[PDB]
Protein backbone atom coordinates (compact mmCIF):
# COMPACT_ATOMS: atom_id res chain seq x y z
CA UNK A 1 0.00 0.00 0.00
CA UNK A 2 2.08 2.90 1.30
CA UNK A 3 5.29 0.91 0.79
CA UNK A 4 4.60 0.34 -2.91
CA UNK A 5 3.50 3.98 -3.21
CA UNK A 6 6.96 4.95 -1.99
CA UNK A 7 8.42 2.32 -4.33
CA UNK A 8 6.30 3.77 -7.14
CA UNK A 9 7.36 7.32 -6.29
CA UNK A 10 11.09 6.67 -5.88
CA UNK A 11 11.27 4.43 -8.96
CA UNK A 12 9.35 7.02 -10.99
CA UNK A 13 11.68 9.73 -9.69
CA UNK A 14 14.68 7.65 -10.76
CA UNK A 15 13.29 7.20 -14.27
CA UNK A 16 12.69 10.95 -14.60
CA UNK A 17 16.24 11.63 -13.42
CA UNK A 18 17.73 9.12 -15.86
CA UNK A 19 15.67 10.56 -18.72
CA UNK A 20 16.83 14.10 -17.97
CA UNK A 21 20.39 12.78 -17.69
CA UNK A 22 20.20 11.36 -21.21
CA UNK A 23 18.60 14.37 -22.90
CA UNK A 24 21.08 16.67 -21.16
CA UNK A 25 23.78 14.55 -22.78
CA UNK A 26 21.77 14.60 -26.01
CA UNK A 27 21.69 18.40 -26.19
CA UNK A 28 25.33 18.58 -25.10
CA UNK A 29 26.22 16.17 -27.90
CA UNK A 30 24.96 18.39 -30.72
CA UNK A 31 26.25 21.57 -29.06
CA UNK A 32 29.89 20.49 -29.10
CA UNK A 33 29.56 19.04 -32.61
CA UNK A 34 28.44 22.51 -33.69
CA UNK A 35 31.25 24.15 -31.72
CA UNK A 36 33.77 21.66 -33.14
CA UNK A 37 33.01 22.71 -36.71
CA UNK A 38 32.70 26.36 -35.65
CA UNK A 39 36.15 26.33 -34.05
CA UNK A 40 37.72 24.35 -36.91
CA UNK A 41 36.15 26.52 -39.61
CA UNK A 42 37.23 29.69 -37.78
CA UNK A 43 40.84 28.47 -37.82
CA UNK A 44 40.64 27.17 -41.37
CA UNK A 45 41.36 23.70 -39.97
CA UNK A 46 39.21 20.78 -41.08
CA UNK A 47 37.37 18.55 -38.60
CA UNK A 48 35.93 15.07 -39.19
CA UNK A 49 33.19 13.91 -36.77
CA UNK A 50 32.89 10.59 -34.95
CA UNK A 51 31.80 7.37 -36.63
CA UNK A 52 28.25 5.99 -36.30
CA UNK A 53 27.83 2.89 -34.14
CA UNK A 54 24.12 2.84 -35.01
CA UNK A 55 22.65 1.78 -38.35
CA UNK A 56 19.00 1.26 -39.28
CA UNK A 57 18.29 -1.13 -42.15
CA UNK A 58 14.90 -1.42 -43.88
CA UNK A 59 14.19 -4.35 -46.17
CA UNK A 60 12.62 -3.00 -49.36
CA UNK A 61 12.37 -6.13 -51.52
CA UNK A 62 10.01 -9.08 -51.25
CA UNK A 63 10.79 -12.71 -50.56
CA UNK A 64 10.45 -13.81 -54.19
CA UNK A 65 13.50 -14.55 -56.34
CA UNK A 66 16.30 -13.88 -53.85
CA UNK A 67 19.64 -15.71 -53.97
CA UNK A 68 20.25 -18.18 -51.14
CA UNK A 69 23.35 -16.27 -50.03
CA UNK A 70 21.19 -13.16 -49.57
CA UNK A 71 18.33 -15.18 -48.05
CA UNK A 72 20.46 -16.31 -45.12
CA UNK A 73 21.71 -12.78 -44.49
CA UNK A 74 18.15 -11.46 -44.29
CA UNK A 75 17.39 -14.21 -41.79
CA UNK A 76 20.28 -13.06 -39.59
CA UNK A 77 19.21 -9.41 -39.66
CA UNK A 78 15.65 -10.68 -39.04
CA UNK A 79 14.21 -8.96 -42.12
CA UNK A 80 11.80 -11.76 -42.96
CA UNK A 81 9.19 -9.47 -44.54
CA UNK A 82 9.23 -6.47 -46.85
CA UNK A 83 9.31 -3.08 -45.03
CA UNK A 84 10.84 -4.60 -41.89
CA UNK A 85 13.64 -2.67 -40.24
CA UNK A 86 15.92 -3.27 -37.26
CA UNK A 87 18.71 -1.55 -35.36
CA UNK A 88 22.17 -2.96 -36.08
CA UNK A 89 25.53 -2.13 -34.53
CA UNK A 90 27.30 -0.25 -37.33
CA UNK A 91 30.69 -1.96 -37.23
CA UNK A 92 33.11 -3.58 -39.66
CA UNK A 93 31.40 -6.99 -39.63
CA UNK A 94 28.23 -5.22 -40.81
CA UNK A 95 29.92 -3.45 -43.73
CA UNK A 96 29.90 -6.64 -45.80
CA UNK A 97 26.66 -7.69 -44.09
CA UNK A 98 24.96 -4.90 -46.05
CA UNK A 99 27.06 -5.27 -49.20
CA UNK A 100 25.81 -8.77 -50.06
CA UNK A 101 22.16 -7.67 -49.71
CA UNK A 102 23.01 -4.17 -50.92
CA UNK A 103 20.20 -4.10 -53.56
CA UNK A 104 17.58 -5.49 -51.14
CA UNK A 105 17.92 -3.05 -48.22
CA UNK A 106 18.18 0.67 -47.71
CA UNK A 107 20.07 1.55 -44.55
CA UNK A 108 21.17 4.77 -42.92
CA UNK A 109 22.12 6.45 -39.68
CA UNK A 110 19.13 7.32 -37.45
CA UNK A 111 18.98 10.56 -35.49
CA UNK A 112 17.30 10.81 -32.09
CA UNK A 113 13.79 11.58 -33.36
CA UNK A 114 13.59 8.53 -35.62
CA UNK A 115 14.76 6.17 -32.87
CA UNK A 116 12.31 7.81 -30.47
CA UNK A 117 9.23 7.59 -32.70
CA UNK A 118 9.83 3.99 -33.77
CA UNK A 119 9.86 2.52 -30.27
CA UNK A 120 7.09 4.76 -28.95
CA UNK A 121 4.71 4.07 -31.85
CA UNK A 122 5.98 0.66 -33.04
CA UNK A 123 7.72 -0.74 -29.97
CA UNK A 124 7.10 -4.45 -29.47
CA UNK A 125 9.38 -6.48 -27.21
CA UNK A 126 10.15 -10.14 -27.78
CA UNK A 127 8.97 -11.37 -24.37
CA UNK A 128 8.62 -15.11 -23.69
CA UNK A 129 8.89 -15.62 -27.46
CA UNK A 130 5.93 -13.27 -27.89
CA UNK A 131 5.45 -9.89 -29.58
CA UNK A 132 4.13 -7.94 -26.59
CA UNK A 133 3.86 -4.16 -27.05
CA UNK A 134 5.73 -1.81 -24.73
CA UNK A 135 2.55 -0.47 -23.15
CA UNK A 136 4.38 0.25 -19.89
CA UNK A 137 7.88 0.23 -18.44
CA UNK A 138 7.25 -2.87 -16.31
CA UNK A 139 7.37 -5.02 -19.46
CA UNK A 140 10.89 -3.80 -20.26
CA UNK A 141 12.07 -4.16 -16.66
CA UNK A 142 10.67 -7.69 -16.38
CA UNK A 143 12.78 -8.47 -19.47
CA UNK A 144 15.77 -6.10 -19.24
CA UNK A 145 16.06 -5.57 -15.48
CA UNK A 146 19.43 -7.33 -15.35
CA UNK A 147 21.01 -4.89 -17.82
CA UNK A 148 19.91 -1.89 -15.68
CA UNK A 149 17.33 -0.96 -18.33
CA UNK A 150 14.07 0.11 -16.70
CA UNK A 151 11.93 2.42 -18.87
CA UNK A 152 11.53 3.07 -22.58
CA UNK A 153 13.87 6.06 -22.46
CA UNK A 154 16.61 3.97 -20.87
CA UNK A 155 15.95 1.49 -23.67
CA UNK A 156 16.03 4.37 -26.17
CA UNK A 157 19.22 5.67 -24.54
CA UNK A 158 20.87 2.25 -24.72
CA UNK A 159 19.96 2.11 -28.41
CA UNK A 160 20.84 5.65 -29.49
CA UNK A 161 24.11 5.82 -27.55
CA UNK A 162 24.92 2.20 -28.53
CA UNK A 163 25.85 1.12 -25.02
CA UNK A 164 27.37 -2.08 -23.67
CA UNK A 165 23.94 -3.76 -23.77
CA UNK A 166 23.12 -2.80 -27.36
CA UNK A 167 22.98 -6.43 -28.49
CA UNK A 168 20.51 -7.59 -25.84
CA UNK A 169 18.25 -4.55 -26.30
CA UNK A 170 18.14 -4.71 -30.09
CA UNK A 171 17.64 -8.48 -29.92
CA UNK A 172 14.77 -7.85 -27.51
CA UNK A 173 13.17 -5.49 -30.06
CA UNK A 174 10.88 -7.31 -32.45
CA UNK A 175 11.68 -6.27 -36.06
CA UNK A 176 9.62 -3.12 -36.57
CA UNK A 177 6.78 -3.70 -39.02
CA UNK A 178 6.47 -0.50 -41.05
CA UNK A 179 3.90 0.64 -43.60
CA UNK A 180 4.58 1.32 -47.27
CA UNK A 181 5.78 4.93 -47.26
CA UNK A 182 3.26 7.74 -47.52
CA UNK A 183 3.72 9.41 -50.88
CA UNK A 184 5.58 6.44 -52.37
CA UNK A 185 9.14 5.87 -53.45
CA UNK A 186 11.04 7.19 -56.42
CA UNK A 187 9.85 5.73 -59.71
CA UNK A 188 12.71 3.25 -60.16
CA UNK A 189 12.84 2.12 -56.55
CA UNK A 190 15.12 -0.88 -57.13
CA UNK A 191 18.23 1.05 -58.22
CA UNK A 192 21.00 2.21 -55.92
CA UNK A 193 20.14 5.34 -53.95
CA UNK A 194 23.21 7.23 -55.15
CA UNK A 195 22.04 6.47 -58.71
CA UNK A 196 18.50 7.78 -58.29
CA UNK A 197 16.99 4.57 -56.90
CA UNK A 198 16.03 3.76 -53.35
CA UNK A 199 18.17 0.74 -52.44
CA UNK A 200 21.33 0.74 -50.41
CA UNK A 201 23.11 3.22 -48.18
CA UNK A 202 21.14 6.48 -48.13
CA UNK A 203 22.95 7.82 -45.05
CA UNK A 204 20.85 10.34 -43.06
CA UNK A 205 17.95 10.10 -45.53
CA UNK A 206 16.60 7.09 -43.63
CA UNK A 207 15.59 9.75 -41.11
CA UNK A 208 13.78 11.44 -44.00
CA UNK A 209 12.15 8.16 -45.03
CA UNK A 210 11.03 6.50 -41.78
CA UNK A 211 8.75 9.49 -41.23
CA UNK A 212 6.95 8.44 -44.43
CA UNK A 213 6.88 4.82 -43.21
CA UNK A 214 4.98 5.53 -39.98
CA UNK B 1 18.02 19.75 -57.91
CA UNK B 2 21.81 19.81 -57.91
CA UNK B 3 24.06 21.65 -55.46
CA UNK B 4 27.64 22.85 -55.51
CA UNK B 5 29.80 20.61 -53.31
CA UNK B 6 33.38 21.41 -52.33
CA UNK B 7 34.59 17.94 -51.34
CA UNK B 8 37.96 17.59 -49.62
CA UNK B 9 39.44 14.32 -48.44
CA UNK B 10 42.57 12.23 -48.13
CA UNK B 11 43.65 8.63 -47.66
CA UNK B 12 43.94 6.98 -44.25
CA UNK B 13 47.30 7.83 -42.61
CA UNK B 14 49.61 4.96 -41.72
CA UNK B 15 53.21 4.41 -40.67
CA UNK B 16 54.28 4.30 -44.32
CA UNK B 17 52.21 7.41 -45.17
CA UNK B 18 51.82 9.54 -42.03
CA UNK B 19 50.61 12.74 -43.74
CA UNK B 20 48.26 12.20 -46.70
CA UNK B 21 47.59 15.08 -49.07
CA UNK B 22 44.25 16.89 -49.01
CA UNK B 23 42.61 16.64 -52.43
CA UNK B 24 39.81 19.04 -53.32
CA UNK B 25 36.95 18.86 -55.81
CA UNK B 26 34.09 21.16 -56.84
CA UNK B 27 31.57 18.58 -58.06
CA UNK B 28 27.79 18.59 -58.33
CA UNK B 29 25.36 16.16 -56.70
CA UNK B 30 21.66 16.12 -55.70
CA UNK B 31 22.60 15.30 -52.09
CA UNK B 32 25.64 14.88 -49.87
CA UNK B 33 25.78 11.11 -50.34
CA UNK B 34 25.90 11.28 -54.14
CA UNK B 35 28.77 13.77 -53.85
CA UNK B 36 30.83 11.15 -52.02
CA UNK B 37 30.07 8.53 -54.68
CA UNK B 38 31.01 10.82 -57.56
CA UNK B 39 34.12 11.86 -55.61
CA UNK B 40 35.36 8.29 -55.24
CA UNK B 41 34.53 7.60 -58.88
CA UNK B 42 36.29 10.75 -60.10
CA UNK B 43 39.41 10.12 -58.03
CA UNK B 44 39.76 6.32 -58.15
CA UNK B 45 39.58 6.26 -61.96
CA UNK B 46 42.39 8.86 -61.97
CA UNK B 47 44.62 8.76 -58.88
CA UNK B 48 43.96 5.12 -57.83
CA UNK B 49 43.28 5.72 -54.12
CA UNK B 50 41.26 2.89 -52.63
CA UNK B 51 37.84 3.46 -51.07
CA UNK B 52 38.47 1.58 -47.82
CA UNK B 53 41.69 3.51 -47.11
CA UNK B 54 40.05 6.90 -47.64
CA UNK B 55 38.16 9.21 -45.30
CA UNK B 56 36.53 12.54 -46.11
CA UNK B 57 37.39 15.55 -44.00
CA UNK B 58 34.71 18.07 -45.03
CA UNK B 59 31.62 18.39 -47.25
CA UNK B 60 30.51 21.98 -47.86
CA UNK B 61 27.83 23.47 -50.10
CA UNK B 62 28.60 26.67 -52.01
CA UNK B 63 25.70 29.03 -52.56
CA UNK B 64 26.03 31.17 -55.67
CA UNK B 65 28.03 34.26 -54.61
CA UNK B 66 26.20 36.73 -56.90
CA UNK B 67 23.13 34.89 -58.21
CA UNK B 68 21.36 38.08 -59.29
CA UNK B 69 24.22 38.96 -61.67
CA UNK B 70 23.76 37.52 -65.16
CA UNK B 71 26.77 35.55 -66.34
CA UNK B 72 28.07 33.41 -69.20
CA UNK B 73 29.51 30.03 -68.22
CA UNK B 74 32.12 27.97 -70.04
CA UNK B 75 31.76 24.25 -69.46
CA UNK B 76 34.42 21.75 -70.51
CA UNK B 77 32.98 18.23 -70.55
CA UNK B 78 33.95 14.78 -71.81
CA UNK B 79 31.30 12.87 -73.73
CA UNK B 80 31.20 9.10 -73.35
CA UNK B 81 29.67 7.33 -76.35
CA UNK B 82 30.21 4.19 -78.41
CA UNK B 83 33.75 5.55 -78.74
CA UNK B 84 33.90 6.86 -75.17
CA UNK B 85 35.95 10.07 -75.53
CA UNK B 86 34.88 13.48 -76.86
CA UNK B 87 36.42 16.79 -75.74
CA UNK B 88 33.23 18.84 -75.89
CA UNK B 89 33.08 22.41 -74.61
CA UNK B 90 29.61 23.94 -74.27
CA UNK B 91 28.70 27.45 -73.16
CA UNK B 92 25.56 28.63 -71.38
CA UNK B 93 24.42 32.05 -70.20
CA UNK B 94 22.38 32.16 -66.99
CA UNK B 95 22.42 33.45 -63.41
CA UNK B 96 23.44 30.49 -61.21
CA UNK B 97 26.36 28.12 -61.64
CA UNK B 98 24.12 25.19 -60.70
CA UNK B 99 21.44 26.35 -63.14
CA UNK B 100 23.91 26.30 -66.02
CA UNK B 101 24.88 22.70 -65.28
CA UNK B 102 21.21 21.69 -65.01
CA UNK B 103 20.66 23.00 -68.54
CA UNK B 104 23.87 21.29 -69.63
CA UNK B 105 22.40 18.03 -68.33
CA UNK B 106 19.17 19.04 -70.06
CA UNK B 107 20.87 19.66 -73.41
CA UNK B 108 23.33 16.75 -73.25
CA UNK B 109 20.54 14.25 -72.60
CA UNK B 110 18.30 15.94 -75.20
CA UNK B 111 20.59 16.84 -78.10
CA UNK B 112 22.86 13.84 -77.58
CA UNK B 113 21.00 11.41 -75.27
CA UNK B 114 23.77 11.33 -72.67
CA UNK B 115 23.61 9.71 -69.22
CA UNK B 116 24.68 11.22 -65.91
CA UNK B 117 27.12 8.41 -65.11
CA UNK B 118 28.61 8.51 -68.61
CA UNK B 119 29.19 12.28 -68.62
CA UNK B 120 31.97 13.53 -66.35
CA UNK B 121 32.23 17.27 -65.75
CA UNK B 122 35.73 18.54 -66.57
CA UNK B 123 35.70 22.23 -65.58
CA UNK B 124 33.11 25.00 -65.23
CA UNK B 125 34.41 28.55 -65.68
CA UNK B 126 32.93 32.02 -65.88
CA UNK B 127 33.27 33.97 -69.12
CA UNK B 128 33.56 37.61 -68.06
CA UNK B 129 34.62 38.96 -71.48
CA UNK B 130 32.34 39.11 -74.50
CA UNK B 131 35.48 38.64 -76.60
CA UNK B 132 36.16 35.44 -74.66
CA UNK B 133 32.70 34.19 -75.68
CA UNK B 134 32.80 32.01 -78.80
CA UNK B 135 29.11 31.35 -79.58
CA UNK B 136 27.27 33.51 -82.10
CA UNK B 137 23.89 33.21 -80.39
CA UNK B 138 25.46 34.12 -77.04
CA UNK B 139 27.39 36.88 -78.82
CA UNK B 140 24.10 38.07 -80.30
CA UNK B 141 22.45 37.75 -76.88
CA UNK B 142 25.28 39.90 -75.47
CA UNK B 143 24.68 42.75 -77.94
CA UNK B 144 23.85 46.23 -76.59
CA UNK B 145 20.55 46.43 -78.49
CA UNK B 146 18.76 43.19 -77.60
CA UNK B 147 15.09 43.21 -78.61
CA UNK B 148 12.61 40.49 -79.55
CA UNK B 149 8.88 39.76 -79.14
CA UNK B 150 8.05 37.15 -76.52
CA UNK B 151 8.45 33.90 -78.47
CA UNK B 152 5.82 31.16 -78.36
CA UNK B 153 3.00 33.68 -78.06
CA UNK B 154 0.56 30.95 -77.01
CA UNK B 155 2.78 30.00 -74.06
CA UNK B 156 2.15 33.46 -72.66
CA UNK B 157 -1.18 33.73 -70.75
CA UNK B 158 -1.83 30.16 -72.07
CA UNK B 159 -5.51 29.66 -71.22
CA UNK B 160 -5.56 30.99 -67.64
CA UNK B 161 -8.32 29.00 -65.96
CA UNK B 162 -8.76 25.90 -63.84
CA UNK B 163 -10.55 23.55 -66.25
CA UNK B 164 -11.72 25.73 -69.13
CA UNK B 165 -13.36 23.15 -71.38
CA UNK B 166 -15.71 24.95 -73.80
CA UNK B 167 -14.47 28.51 -73.74
CA UNK B 168 -17.25 30.83 -74.97
CA UNK B 169 -15.02 32.97 -77.20
CA UNK B 170 -12.01 32.52 -79.44
CA UNK B 171 -8.64 33.38 -77.87
CA UNK B 172 -6.89 36.41 -79.34
CA UNK B 173 -3.34 35.13 -78.71
CA UNK B 174 -1.58 38.27 -79.89
CA UNK C 1 -4.03 -6.97 -19.94
CA UNK C 2 -3.39 -4.40 -22.68
CA UNK C 3 -6.54 -4.83 -24.72
CA UNK C 4 -5.39 -1.98 -26.98
CA UNK C 5 -2.26 -0.03 -27.84
CA UNK C 6 -2.71 3.72 -27.39
CA UNK C 7 -0.21 5.83 -29.30
CA UNK C 8 2.18 7.56 -26.87
CA UNK C 9 3.03 10.26 -29.43
CA UNK C 10 -0.65 11.25 -29.72
CA UNK C 11 -2.12 10.35 -26.30
CA UNK C 12 -0.87 12.69 -23.58
CA UNK C 13 -2.04 10.46 -20.72
CA UNK C 14 -0.22 7.46 -22.17
CA UNK C 15 2.83 9.65 -22.80
CA UNK C 16 3.01 10.72 -19.15
CA UNK C 17 2.50 7.10 -18.09
CA UNK C 18 5.41 5.89 -20.23
CA UNK C 19 7.79 8.84 -19.70
CA UNK C 20 7.59 10.73 -16.39
CA UNK C 21 9.81 13.52 -17.65
CA UNK C 22 7.71 14.85 -20.53
CA UNK C 23 5.93 16.95 -17.88
CA UNK C 24 8.89 19.38 -17.73
CA UNK C 25 10.83 19.35 -21.01
CA UNK C 26 11.05 22.96 -22.32
CA UNK C 27 11.93 22.28 -25.96
CA UNK C 28 12.65 25.66 -27.53
CA UNK C 29 15.75 26.82 -25.65
CA UNK C 30 16.78 30.48 -25.96
CA UNK C 31 20.45 29.51 -25.87
CA UNK C 32 21.58 32.24 -28.27
CA UNK C 33 20.64 35.92 -28.56
CA UNK C 34 20.66 38.52 -31.30
CA UNK C 35 24.43 38.49 -30.62
CA UNK C 36 25.40 35.78 -33.11
CA UNK C 37 29.22 35.61 -33.40
CA UNK C 38 29.76 34.99 -37.11
CA UNK C 39 33.02 33.00 -37.20
CA UNK C 40 34.48 31.96 -40.55
CA UNK C 41 38.09 31.50 -41.56
CA UNK C 42 39.11 33.99 -44.23
CA UNK C 43 41.26 31.34 -45.90
CA UNK C 44 38.31 28.96 -45.57
CA UNK C 45 36.12 31.55 -47.31
CA UNK C 46 38.75 32.00 -50.03
CA UNK C 47 39.12 28.27 -50.65
CA UNK C 48 35.31 28.10 -50.59
CA UNK C 49 34.99 30.70 -53.36
CA UNK C 50 37.78 29.15 -55.43
CA UNK C 51 37.56 28.63 -59.20
Amino acid sequence: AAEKKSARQKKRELIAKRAEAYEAEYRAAEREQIELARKARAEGNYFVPHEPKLIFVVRIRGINNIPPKARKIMQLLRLLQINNGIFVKFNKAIKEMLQVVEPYVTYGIPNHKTVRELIYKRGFGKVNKQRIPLSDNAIIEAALGKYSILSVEDLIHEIYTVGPNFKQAANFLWPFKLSSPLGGWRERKFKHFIEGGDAGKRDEHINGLVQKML
Amino acid sequence: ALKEYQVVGRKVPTEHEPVPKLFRMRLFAPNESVAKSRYWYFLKMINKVKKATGEIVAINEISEPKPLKAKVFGIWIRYDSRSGTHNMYKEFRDTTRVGAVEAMYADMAARHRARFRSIRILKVVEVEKKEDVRRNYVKQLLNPHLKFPLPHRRTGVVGLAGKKVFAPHRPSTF
Amino acid sequence: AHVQKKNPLKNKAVLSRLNPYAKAYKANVKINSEKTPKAAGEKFLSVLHEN
Binding site: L36, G44, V48 | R24, M25, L43 | -
Partner: peptide
Protein backbone atom coordinates in the same frame (compact mmCIF):
# COMPACT_ATOMS: atom_id res chain seq x y z
CA UNK D 1 36.83 5.91 -36.97
CA UNK D 2 37.40 8.48 -34.22
CA UNK D 3 37.10 12.25 -34.36
CA UNK D 4 40.34 14.10 -35.03
CA UNK D 5 41.60 17.26 -36.72
CA UNK D 6 43.38 17.24 -40.07
CA UNK D 7 45.94 20.04 -39.86
CA UNK D 8 46.30 21.96 -43.12
CA UNK D 9 49.65 23.57 -42.28
CA UNK D 10 52.13 22.59 -45.02
CA UNK D 11 49.32 20.37 -46.38
CA UNK D 12 47.37 22.90 -48.42
CA UNK D 13 44.65 21.43 -50.67
CA UNK D 14 45.06 22.01 -54.41
CA UNK D 15 41.97 21.43 -56.52
CA UNK D 16 41.72 18.46 -58.86
CA UNK D 17 40.05 17.89 -62.21
CA UNK D 18 39.59 14.74 -64.29
CA UNK D 19 41.65 14.21 -67.42
Amino acid sequence: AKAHFVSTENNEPVTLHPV
